[PDB]
């Protein structure tokens, strides 16, 4: 009966302060902790200011959808930084299972649509990252070059922990390491990555009509990708 009471805005003031481990966000002069009670320490002033804005904006009760940056920072601290090596390997492994490699084999018009959108991104990764992926069509298998898989592993493992946290959903939601890397490396923005990731579903929708459930999911996945992109930029 008191669950919302516990989630109320019980603080008056919000500010920030730099500690040895990073920036803290202060609620009436007390550093915010994660839900697991770990110290919340942030890599940049910009992220601390933006998280402080989330906590200043709380009206009567804490609303987590209004606090996307807090949610990402909690994950960085509780999940990604302590599991960095594992998470980095997992994300890097999407190089071997990349959306952009697995083309349709039919109809012809879909093959062409996929190439128009995705071949520039393959080419970008080939030249910028020295990571040329192989593509295939339909059920024909093709393995990636072990050296390319290495390069993509190394690229992901080179990130800092909050940056890896930001990358995560930019990879997993569209199912593409290349699209995620293209966002964090500035080749495309998140709305463009989202659109590219949907070429098959939009081809089908233009032929057979839109599915409102699928469209609702895609819109929720765009806002999520925008939130990850924002977290990337704020943590530089």
For the chain, the structural domain boundaries read: 1-66, 67-236
Specify the resolution in Å: 1.0
* Sheet strands (E) in 132-230: 136-137
Length of the chain: 236
217 within 8 A of 225, measured Cβ to Cβ: no
Angstrom distance (rounded) from CA 74 to CA 51:
11
Q: How many Cβ atoms are within 10 Å of 124's Cβ, its own excluded?
A: 17
Q: φ and ψ at 80, to 5 degrees?
A: -80, -50
Cα angle 74, 169, 46 (rounded to 5 degrees) comes to: 50
Identify any residues that bridge with 214 across adjacent strands, giving them in sequence order.
Answer: none
131 within 8 A of 95, measured Cβ to Cβ: yes
The approach used to solve this structure was: X-ray
| Residues 6+ positions from 152 with CB-CB distance below 8 Å | 92, 95, 129, 131, 177, 181
Please give the CATH number for the structural domain made up of 1-66: 3.30.2180.10
Q: How many Cβ atoms are within 10 Å of 40's Cβ, its own excluded?
A: 23
Nearest to 193 by CA among 118, 103, 127: 118
Angstrom distance (rounded) from CA 68 to CA 75:
11
How far from chain centre, in Å, is Cα 222? 10
Nearest to 186 by CA among 115, 116, 129: 129
94 within 8 A of 148, measured Cβ to Cβ: no
Gap between the terminal Cα atoms of the chain: 42
The angle, 0 to 180 degrees and rounded to 10, between the axes of the packed helices 68-75 and 212-234 is 70
CATH for the 67-236 domain, from 3.40.50.300, 3.40.190.10, 1.10.3580.10, 3.40.640.10: 1.10.3580.10
How far from chain centre, in Å, is Cα 88? 13
Question: Which residue reads 């952009």 in tokens?
Answer: 100
Burial class (CB in 10 A: 0-12, 13-18, 19+), 56: middle
Strand 22-27 to 14-19 pairing: antiparallel
Q: How many Cβ atoms are within 10 Å of 21's Cβ, its own excluded?
A: 11
Strand 136-137 to 102-103 pairing: parallel
Q: Where are the alpha helices (DSSP H) in 2-107?
A: 3-6, 45-56, 68-75, 84-92
DSSP state of 170: H
Cis peptide before 107 (omega within 30 of 0): yes
Angstrom distance (rounded) from CA 138 to CA 106:
8
């Amino acid at each position: 009966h008191m669950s919302e009471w516990k989630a109320r805005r019980f603080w008056a003031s919000v500010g920030i302060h730099k500690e040895e481990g990073g920036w803290a966000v202060l609620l009436d002069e007390r550093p915010l902790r994660t839900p697991g009670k770990q110290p919340l320490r942030l890599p940049t002033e910009a992220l601390a200011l933006a998280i402080a804005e989330e906590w200043q904006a709380v009206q009567e009760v804490i609303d987590p959808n209004a606090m996307p940056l807090t949610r990402s920072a909690n994950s960085a601290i509780e999940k990604v930084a302590p599991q960095f090596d594992a998470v980095a390997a997992m994300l890097g492994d999407y190089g071997g299972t990349d959306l952009l490699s697995y083309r349709a084999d039919a109809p012809e018009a879909l093959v062409r649509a996929q190439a128009e959108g995705w071949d520039p991104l393959i080419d970008w990764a080939a030249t910028e990252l020295r990571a040329p992926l192989r593509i295939t069509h339909g059920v024909i298998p093709v393995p990636q070059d072990p050296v390319v898989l290495l390069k993509l592993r190394a690229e992901v493992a080179s990130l800092d922990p909050f940056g890896l946290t930001a990358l995560h959903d930019l990879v997993t939601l569209p199912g593409s390491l290349i699209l995620g890397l293209a966002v964090i490396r500035g080749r495309i923005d998140a709305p463009t990555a989202h659109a590219l990731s949907r070429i098959d579903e939009e081809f089908q929708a233009e032929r057979w009509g839109r599915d409102e459930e699928a469209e609702a999911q895609a819109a929720s996945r765009l806002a999520a990708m925008r939130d990850s992109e924002r977290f990337w930029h704020l943590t530089r």
